[model samples]
Target: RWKHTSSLKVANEPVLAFTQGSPERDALQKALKDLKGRMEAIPCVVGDEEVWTSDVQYQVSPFNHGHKVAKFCYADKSLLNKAIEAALAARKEWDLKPIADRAQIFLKAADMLSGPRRAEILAKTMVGQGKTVIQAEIDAAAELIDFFRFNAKYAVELEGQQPISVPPSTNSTVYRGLEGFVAAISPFNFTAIGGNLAGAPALMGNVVLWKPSDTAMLASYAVYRILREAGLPPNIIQFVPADGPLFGDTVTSSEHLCGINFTGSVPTFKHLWKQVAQNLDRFHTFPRLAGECGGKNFHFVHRSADVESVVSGTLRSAFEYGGQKCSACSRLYVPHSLWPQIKGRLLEEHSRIKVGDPAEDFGTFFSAVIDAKSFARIKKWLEHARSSPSLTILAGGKCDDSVGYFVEPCIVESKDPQEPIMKEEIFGPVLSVYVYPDDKYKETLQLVDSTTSYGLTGAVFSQDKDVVQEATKVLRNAAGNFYINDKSTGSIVGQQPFGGARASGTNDKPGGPHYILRWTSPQVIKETHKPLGDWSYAYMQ
Candidate 1:
């Protein structure tokens, strides 16, 4: 664990600059040490409960010219309070900005992210987050650019649409944005999930107060810099990395905060839900609350499908980023007919995947568990998997931290569909394959639905149109986003609205238009004509 040395103080903020590193490894390291020393040099107060529990740790990955990465301690209670205060001060002015102007700013941000500095920003992201070069480039840089651009497009579209009852002659019609600050908190997966959530409220002229997962601070900072360069307001969107001690108290119950967009675990969501519930008096005007919690996403492969497809799909879904994704396939249902073929293909595919340092050109695969708590939990699951009577280990179930926090992918073949391994969500590089009878498609559907508490994403692979269509309908309710004859992961931004229900989220709406709605408050306008002088006695006349 990292060590903390002092009580936290909130800083004014930093100017936006190009983090595209020309690798200042030694000098920056020394400078950071000096900065840390300066921080310690300051006199500070430490209360038993107010002191930050976690310390910021710094590391550099050689993947992108050794980008400097810092896990800033969570915003201590005071910092969070100050951030909320700043957001409240900025909210009214931000909300009053014309939608067109707000959209233009985002458009400008998209342009900056897509320009000559893209590689610089992208490289910084890859190095800071230890992401595959291509994944970080696409996810952090390209996808964020696209998300902002799309939000701008949607903003303009929103401007054009008018209320159905508005009269042509009416002068009282109006358009508006939500009235307060939009709080956004995102997890560590896709470095730009924070960007997407922030863009929504920000595009609608609402100031954003973001608390990015401490792990991806560099990437989030990169985004903040780019947006600032594009002319965003000083206090428009404050990105604060405070200790999470008062996060619940600050965000859940704050009267000044009007919206929250989150992507993280369900327990936290539940806690937040209760926090919001605890403040009903503050909710006379409804708040915009939206989130994407964890899911037990799965991939169902029919016997009619080719084994090669299952092999490629399952591996890509599970192994990508070491399975730290909301859409990563944790459960796989394979028909009995294709079990042998699929198992053989998985073995071959596993051999082909190379894992080592992420800096190597072909070293796209590597591992380092997020933290010890998660690692210990995954280890217990792996142990249960190997001991289960209904499951057989097909390939790879080993963790070797000698080089890095490495854990090999585990493939477990399920003998009974009712097996506990088949029903639970073991979020790791572990894929449990369950074989089912082909004729019992209905039973398979039931098994898939009842397998987990989450319903985020899933896929159905079959050649027969009739079977495919029926299976699609049956499992439609099982996933927020469902696929046919394709892998369940790799959801594109414009192509699909990404979210789910049934323990996945409160709202079933997908991530695109539906998500944007949660960030805005649409107001209806009405106009009435004054009664004519002679109209009062019309009935009697």
Candidate 2:
């Protein structure tokens, strides 16, 4: 029997500075040096066995594109099936534990990540995922740390959400774990997203079969180790790295897949949804599907806005992490009156963004794209922008992949609001602008709202109170995370619970109370303090 504990309070983890002689700087230095010496071959963990094979993929740093940092084996169908079985087997025992016991495991993991292994994890992200030092620190160190700590408290809170009792008849509600295992398909972008995808369900007492993205295997594996070190049983959460289609086929067709926690592209997520829908008859219950997908985020600047603040927000939102974040602003809507000022300031800010090896320089702002394919795709998009007569290159349109997959932060102004470049998600350091008449601010809001299929993030910059209100109401459904005089990127865990609706995601805000509910099914419990002698009501009799 489990007893309700006191309410749990959560707060965001503090980010660190890279100042010389600081503990944060020293820790990062040691972690980087230590990573340079070791090249461990990762394997799929199926129960107690570490499944290894000759079919291996090398981990390469996008910043140093040609060099191999580490390697990992890709799981085959048999190994994947074994991992699923391991999860199902573990779930029987895992689901039997009290919520408090399960939550403590993740709390311990958070403690370890925030304390001793913070730098090592951050270093692995930099070496393996091409993140700048600051990017890695915020993601692997701070965000992941917050996910574990906050979700632990969230689990406790979820369990305490019981049904109220009435008069002579007493009733209660129990939060039951999903009937079977969870398949957590994570992305390459954020180390924290991966942790939350798998750890959230696990903290709710469901076992998970985690498939780390190919591009982010090294960092994801390191995070997995932290969970293991913190005492998560091997069978409770198995790491099964494999190709996308093969992994999908193995997991989607499984009878034990109770739910899927996914963070990736829209096409892939929709495909998974289709497969799960088709296999509905095969499953014991309707499997829960929660996904956070791609976005073509935007920022609209009004004539009444503070020009300097709008410029700062535009630069940060569009170019931070080379515009790799799903919440990154890829489109900008500026009033015609402010276009010259905004454009000039944007170019001035772009000149200061240093692109190079993030590991070599602590102050470096941008790093390379994730891989060759991404570089090629981003480069192709840049080429299209350059040739299109409907667009004018306001600042940068340069690309060089000879060393790393580095591309300059490009700013293109579109004469037509319906230009193809304005509609697409580049997922790179390319921001497209559409200057609108200051008088048609309301019409421009409609254009921005109807421009794309995504509803992830968007910002409205205005100093005028009426203008901000008008934009807010007009573009209400445009973005899940709507910003006012702020950049659309860098959403904190506890404060801005992230996620979006429509093409973006299920709008089940992670780090909020609603996220854990997806992993659980509530059951009602009733006790009769007094029994009725008759089966019918007195009035009916």
Candidate 3:
């Protein structure tokens, strides 16, 4: 029914700078202006029909909370069930389509993301997600496009791994979609993640029920539309926005849930896992659960490390996008010998950095946290840092949400490394540091490993090969994505495949080749060219 095209190759999308008076800056500003006050309507696209339920929700800019960016409604239980049925029906045909054809749709999506929709999605991410233009460009544009293109290339490679057949028999392995549909629950941080969570499964021929984060609705809807424009079939990936538990309950209780691709907090993922267990006997297939929960990522410093690299990387890793990224450095451990120098450089960097609306103030390093709840949550940790005797605010401890939910890039020094500020996932621009005696490097390494259950990301700063090797060996299980003499954040799509274990989800690397195999339920067949052999062995006769 379809003509197969050869699999394509990929290169990382070129990241563009939107500096003042540059062409990208001008275009981004224009797109921002066009989309600013439109209050775009986002609906639940269930089987090609838009349903606006009684649940009326408005998405306002995190920087300018009064400015409404989009208007959307929720999908109730009946609608969710309707989508489940529609997706199951659609899967019958979509799952049978050639993998090469499936690959083409996403490759085309990458082109569309790179070409026409680049600026628009960047603008949406800037406003809806409160990311600076650069952060938005990295996430909503470059990272997302890279996910699409690279996943397309990897999917074909995965399909090409056919089992060798002996003479007189033709053997083939069919990478079939799961028996039922997949539920893709995405986070509010990166628009790229939302797309990959849904698109990757769909690329493997699984129909998906995509639930976009409330805070990241507009940009997510923009991605859904781009996939549609790129020739993705209707009902293949339904964009359903709903209350978290309602969506979770509806999807998990279904007999047709084949998988759930999620990116969120640890507790939520655990809760969902429990629900799946509760209805374990009801499903047609055991659901494959893949999640990327948030982490308390850290930067461990050695005595023989570059001060400048530590300072610059720490400043960016701890504060960029208000430290809202899942991989943001929430904890910092520095040796006493490098403390004063690292402290001075970090303070200097902190003093010069600006925090505001990136659309209006292009020079600002970061913007607001996602919304009111996040603002309140982050404020609690800052207050804890202020009141605690062992902790001292070294630089920037301020939360001003009168205009926006903006928290200054706060750096706190903790006398006790086990302080809640040092161990917990604050999910904001608060960097808590613990200074250790240089002689106690091994003990501190042990402390870093034992401090948190999170194994998501971490980095060690060292120039000495012995120290690097020692730290790498000692802190082997501390982080899933480890960095040497570098910051823990900014894991690129192609170069660094990112995920984690322990409490940090299933460690299924979405940007890597193995991620495509997660959604498939394979079937193998052999065609015999010779006459049938005897049923029983010759010795048995």
Q: Which one wins on lDDT?
A: 3
| Error of model 1, residue 506, in angstroms | 3.1
lDDT scores in order: 0.67, 0.87, 0.90
Predict model 3's lDDT versus the native: 0.90
Off by over 4 Å in 2: 1-5, 529-532
Ranking by TM-score: 3, 2, 1
Q: Which regions of candidate 1 deviate over 4 angstroms?
A: 1-68, 164-168, 171-175, 507-511, 527-537
- After superposition, the stretches of candidate 3 with alpha carbons farther than 4 Å from their true spots are 1-7
Clashes of 2: 0
- Expressed as tens digits, the lDDT of each residue in 223-320 for candidate 3 is 99889988899889998999999999999999999999999999999999999999999998899999899889999999889989999998899899
Q: Pairing residues by index, what is the TM-score of model 1?
A: 0.85
- What would the TM-score be for candidate 3 when compared with the true structure? 0.98
Task: Kindly list the per-residue Cα lDDT of model 1 for residues 36-72, writing each as its tens digit.
Answer: 2121211111211222335454433322222334534
TM-score of each: 0.85, 0.97, 0.98
What's the best-to-worst order under lDDT?
A: 3, 2, 1
